[PDB]
């Protein structure tokens, strides 16, 4: 639906949609920008991620409310409506994964872009895994694991331990271990090792970079406090 709008206008309206907290519009604008076929800048990648994270975040929150009501129940209405929200969530995840596959990841050569997109691929397979129950559940979980793992291998070779993308990736991969893969010890080990190696690299950073890194580092600490 966005094929007739200029790339620059789509980016400008995505930023306007963010200010208006219109995240469905934001995602549609950024999907149109991706489909122009050019690679995304650092700022543009963040706009894409912010838009779809907010859209699927609302869907996940609603799915969790309905799933809880459904569990307490066990007519068809609660199941039907949970299935409706579930299907809409899966549609958004499939859309994001389709953008990554066609063709963001294959064109991403720099570490900061490639790690960003692979982390995104892990995240949205993780969201699919949260609602999966069928014959493809193990394959969905492994698709999330594979994307996170490739992103992790690149980040450890190409990025300092305080890099915010590296930190956010490790944070989310540790959540994957705890919440999806039933591996709480792997989750705790990853969070601790990530936090400690970031701590040892903070001395290299400017005041602003130090603020960026310690902010995500606190989320690792929050999870370790929750988990131990």
């Amino acid at each position: 639906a966005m094929g007739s709008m200029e790339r620059a206008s789509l980016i400008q309206k995505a930023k306007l949609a963010e200010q208006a907290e219109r995240y469905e519009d934001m995602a549609a604008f950024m999907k149109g920008a991706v489909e122009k076929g050019e690679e995304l800048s650092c700022e543009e990648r963040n706009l894409l991620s912010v838009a779809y994270k907010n859209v699927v975040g609302g869907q996940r929150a609603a799915w969790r409310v309905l799933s809880s009501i459904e569990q307490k129940s066990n007519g068809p209405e609660v199941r039907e409506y949970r299935e409706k929200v579930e299907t809409e969530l899966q549609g958004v995840c499939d859309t994001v994964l389709g953008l990554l596959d066609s063709h963001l990841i294959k064109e991403a050569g720099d570490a900061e872009s490639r790690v960003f997109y692979l982390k995104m691929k892990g995240d949205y397979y993780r969201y699919l895994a949260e609602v999966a129950t069928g014959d493809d559940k193990k394959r969905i979980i492994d698709s999330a694991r594979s994307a996170y793992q490739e992103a992790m291998d690149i980040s450890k070779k190409e990025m300092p331990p305080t890099n915010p993308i590296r930190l956010g990736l490790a944070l989310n991969f540790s959540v994957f271990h705890y919440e999806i893969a039933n591996s709480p010890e792997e989750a705790i080990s990853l969070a601790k090792t990530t936090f400690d190696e970031a701590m040892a690299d903070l001395h290299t950073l400017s005041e602003d970079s130090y603020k960026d890194s310690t902010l995500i580092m606190q989320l690792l600490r929050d999870n370790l406090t929750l988990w131990t």
Binding site: D123, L167, G168, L171, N172, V175, Y178, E179, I216, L219, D222, N223, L226, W227
Partner: peptide, 6 residues
């Protein structure tokens, strides 16, 4: 329950 990147 746990924090993912936000």
């Amino acid at each position: 329950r746990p924090s993912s990147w936000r």
